[PDB]
Here is the input.
Amino acid sequence: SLQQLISETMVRWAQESVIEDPELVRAMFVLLHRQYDGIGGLVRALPKTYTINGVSVEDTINLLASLGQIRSLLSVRMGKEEEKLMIRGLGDIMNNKVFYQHPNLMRALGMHETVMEVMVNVLGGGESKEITFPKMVANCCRFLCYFCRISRQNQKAMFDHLSYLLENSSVGLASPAMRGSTPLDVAAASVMDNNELALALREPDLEKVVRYLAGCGLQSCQMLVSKGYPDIGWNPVEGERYLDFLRFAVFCNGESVEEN
Amino acid sequence: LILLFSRTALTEKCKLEEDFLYMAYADIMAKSCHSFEEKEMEKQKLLYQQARLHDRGAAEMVLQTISASKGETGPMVAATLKLGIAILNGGNSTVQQKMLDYLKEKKDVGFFQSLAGLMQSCSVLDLNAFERQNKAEGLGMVTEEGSGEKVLQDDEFTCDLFRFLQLLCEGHNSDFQNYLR
Amino acid sequence: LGVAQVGRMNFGKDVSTLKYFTICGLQEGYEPFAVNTNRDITMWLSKRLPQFLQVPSNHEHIEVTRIDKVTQKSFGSQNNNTDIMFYRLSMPIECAXXXXXXXXXXXXXXXXXXXXXXXXXXXXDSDFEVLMKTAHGHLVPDRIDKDKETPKPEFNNHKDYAQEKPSRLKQXXXXXXXXXXXXX
Amino acid sequence: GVEIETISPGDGRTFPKKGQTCVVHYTGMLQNGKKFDSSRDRNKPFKFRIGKQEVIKGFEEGAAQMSLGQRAKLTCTPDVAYGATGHPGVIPPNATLIFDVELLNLE
Amino acid sequence: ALSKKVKLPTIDLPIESVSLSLQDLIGYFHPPDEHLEHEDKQNRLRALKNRQNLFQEEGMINLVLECIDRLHVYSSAAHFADVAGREAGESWKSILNSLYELLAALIRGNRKNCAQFSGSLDWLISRLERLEASSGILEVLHCVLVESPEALNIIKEGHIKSIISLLDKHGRNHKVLDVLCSLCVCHGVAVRSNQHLICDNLLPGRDLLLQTRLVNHVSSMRPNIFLGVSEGSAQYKKWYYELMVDHTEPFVTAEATHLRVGWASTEGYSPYPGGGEEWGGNGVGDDLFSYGFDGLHLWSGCIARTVSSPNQHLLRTDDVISCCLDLSAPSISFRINGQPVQGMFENFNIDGLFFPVVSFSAGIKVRFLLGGRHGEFKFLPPPGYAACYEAVLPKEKLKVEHSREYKQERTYTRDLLGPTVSLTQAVPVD
Amino acid sequence: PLSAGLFKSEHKNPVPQCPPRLHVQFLSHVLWSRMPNQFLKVDVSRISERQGWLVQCLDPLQFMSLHIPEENRSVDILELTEQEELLQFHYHTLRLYSAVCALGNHRVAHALCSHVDEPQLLYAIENKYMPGLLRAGYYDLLIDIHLSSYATARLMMNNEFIVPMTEETKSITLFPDENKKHGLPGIGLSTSLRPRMRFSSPSFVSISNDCYQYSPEFPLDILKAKTIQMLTEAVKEGSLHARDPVGGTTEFLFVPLIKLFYTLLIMGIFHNEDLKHILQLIEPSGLLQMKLPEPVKLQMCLLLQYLCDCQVRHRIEAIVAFSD
Here is the structure.
């Protein structure tokens, strides 16, 4: 009988007087729509609902606490201690056991999107003048790599952000300190070993990789000439990474994708 | 509600936001509308249902929502085109004249350029994606893509846009026929 | 209320106790002052203890200016009736546990009372000047070796005093008879 | 450096020794009278072990010489309380502390 | 050409022209009124946004910055007067204010322009201590902080310390607090560095801002006794009275229950002694017109001093204190459980009508002790010291008012009173 | 070395300048005093027994007072009603107190708890004669220092329905709806994964606090009882439409109170009986039938949103129980 009096008051307030403060009327109308549709909340929440068991409770509680801490840290500007806590939380959620038995729960919780929106905040600021907070980039890249690896559907989920992250995939390379964690490497890992995704990989981004490869083969990295390297007329590092990604894109399960 | 939506669409921005409230209520407002007497009585109840809300500003609200997208195919224009369809079912010369008067009294170009930008990028059957999906199905039982197997994108949106452009000139409204050129 | 005058006020809220409301007020649409109230009124009054207040710009017969080498705070007034004022600086200087001394050095040398007793107290700087027809006595923060404030006097300087005082709220016209206490 | 001024005697029989837990109820205050802490506001006594290096030295060495039911005035020194850095946010550097500590129970 | 060195004054100084130009440009960037149609307001907003964009894309923010730079090299209107003339000297302040207002209006709403010139905050916060344009600089810094979050990234400890020193130097300004609020959070996101800086540099000392505390309601009780010594009629200058307690509680709700006793003076020979005005946490001893004792310290002018005593303890239950008062040569004295205390308030002002008083906060049961039908002494008075039941004038009643006024928990039927006289009585004919 | 260089921050500056704070203050008489609305109620024996003069005082009474340091004077909280400058400055001071610990920063909240007080906040939220702005500021500060962190942590996980398969979970499969009844929102059993709550005790005599990770401790039972009592008093006051709402206008009375009640309802208190009593406050067919201003209905909307979210959660839990 809650919908009854809610809808009564809802229409009574709007009929009594014109109402300023558009946020008030917005909240009022979303409430009215919720009361009348009813099953919209169900169809919205059931994809996000989940059940596990009556035995593994402390583990999932720790996982949820770590994820909440990650989200709270997202709401704060990045600093040294913020980076340390984020790295700790990522390690904790990677080490938790529920992470493996129920991979659909992570997608229903949108953890990949949270890590993605953390890494995009870190990767902003500049494009070729600062790659600050490199450990935070690496931790996000390796978490996303592991997340996409242990599934079939998480690869499809990460394929959506693959298009964006290829624009700033040039970071973290040209340094043999992160042969794993990298946006280009997480893109390769998402599109790795799936013929459906390899086919769905159309050409808004293969040409982008080709331009990056051409730029790498025409210009060497200024960081190398700063370190004291003999300044070869081209760069064999960013090119090798682009070639590895293209290899992952073309070759799948032992048979070359003809269109790619 | 109509004034709230109109003000939200009138606030100067650079990209039409998601606005779930609008996406939820413009579908209720669209589905609210709709042997000689049996075919005219329903046409008169349709005129009554359309007058139940286009005299409250929906004719201008749809126009402003289309103008506030500047040519971006999304789930917001896809719902306001259906609202326009529901409000212009049949030859509703009154609503046509209200929109024409609105467009003539507020000399805005951001509506016609938005229509051009939306129509220039609606959808085209691409053969490459079709054979690619066929090869994917042949290799393995991959689930069928929802948006027309990812070969025709928002065909319903294109049909709704062109049906809206038709209803804007339905009957023989020469004024709007010349204003569209 | 005047001298030795006591009274009583009634703002309403007790119509059973209100006497002359039905006689006048009940018929002409007149309402009690506190009829629609759930709690009593605070009933502010005029305080007696005279605390210190900043000199307002819209105050007659007392003008305080500000200049700025050295920094000065000049005075001024235009009036026909004279009295004595109790001007005081706003922020007081605090004394630590060890330091506890105060010497008043005039134009010549240090010749005054030995008011050198303050374990830990706040001494607000002040000068008590009589209001003449022309009163240009002022304060000047100067420096020789330590914190020095010179309240520079002018002609007709025989009843104005200048010292440092803690919180003290007394308005009168006396030279001494100040409250004191020596704890053994 | 910590000095004690008793306010109410606690029969001077039971004294805190190493390996015990003490129950105190205190309302600290700065030197200028500005109250910075109290254990009566939250209505929960302060429980702490003796000799485990969990509370300040100026508090623990002073509480270790008190008795059950004995109220005392504990005056501390900056080096024995917080040093030249103080407590970030609350205690300014080189500040003395005063604690009105009463012992409710001694276990 | 005038500020670089001493040159001949054949220069074009458009003082009034630049004043009028600034006054027109400020209204040229006037934000739209809130009492306007929504569409017209949006049109004006878009117009002002485009205007700000075209004015910024010409680098005229740096131009007005250079102008205020060259104008800030002076100190006051008097300093500028004897160098640039009477008109320029008297209009320099208004020109600076108009320039700062224009700079603020140029950045009121744009997110791009602020992100463009954010690099000038190192200069803005440095000149923030001009003391003649501090309002304008503070408003500009507030409007630039509330818009772009990147500007908070360049705020270092020096800037926060400078802002806090401004708040400590220029008094209580309610805009510095808004600036610090915008420094803590900018757009739904917080910066922990600035939050910690504010918390660690602004209020550890408690000198600023306004502190606060929760104290108890204390009251006082006094009998109808008045003691006035002078030449002529005297009252033997010797009085004594005891006090016992039945039940007490140290902490009733949150703080130590106020419990003091002593003798309070008056103003002249009239009631209403000076002190803590009324209804505060001030009892006896919290002013220079009262002298009290509470078991541990001697209170005089809201300053306590501890004194030694055999078994010095707070006034617990079943404690008998006796207060003695001689007026001329010695002073008030207190003895706890018979044995006297080691302190007294010597060399105090004898002007006024002294009277016994007791101050308490809550949770207390106190008993005055006199001789005769009023009570019974527990100890023996020292030789000479009489009591208050003997201090009462012959053929007059003796009761107990509170201290000053109608501190009674009563309804509107309270007898509010005005001023009074000095009892009209407080030598033969020649 | 100087007078100005002794009562300010800097001391190594031997240049005798004068800040704007240095202004002459004269002993003025234009000053009003406030007669308190509550006294000590001291009762004299009135018998004049032959064994002394008795005076008795039992009922306690407290009040809060601002302390201006550069004037070294204490002033009652309620006297700010007339002084607009100190009122506005203290309102902005409370706003800054809430802003320095707005987000999930607890190192600063543990300091602010002692910086103001623990129960002085309760006194301010309990007082009736507050200036309104100060009442709202104290309410917001009380929410921020303790409740805000866990409220946000519990609201982030409000659209994620994780439920175990315990035998207690397999008990709400009925979700009483037949035999002519519909149940009550938020009443029943949850058995749903929700973030646990814990608050650390604020202590600064303890050296090397472990982490102070979560929040300063605050008594919740007294707070919830006090909120229920004031909400009942507030609805009774608003029903008669007087001209002296608590804190000035009626929005100052209702908005902070309903905001505190709403955040308390979010954070997982008001067990079944309390939810029944709070419901009977509004449900009888009250609070939704009154003439309420816009900021009040704006909070009523969020309240109803939570009452619908709990019903959705109960439906999801029943779905899982039957699907088992």
Residues 58-74 of chain A form the longest helix (17 residues). Chains A and C do not touch (no CB pair under 8 Å). Residues 52 and 101 of chain A are 9 Å apart (CA to CA). Strands of chain A lie at 49-51, 251-252, 255-256.
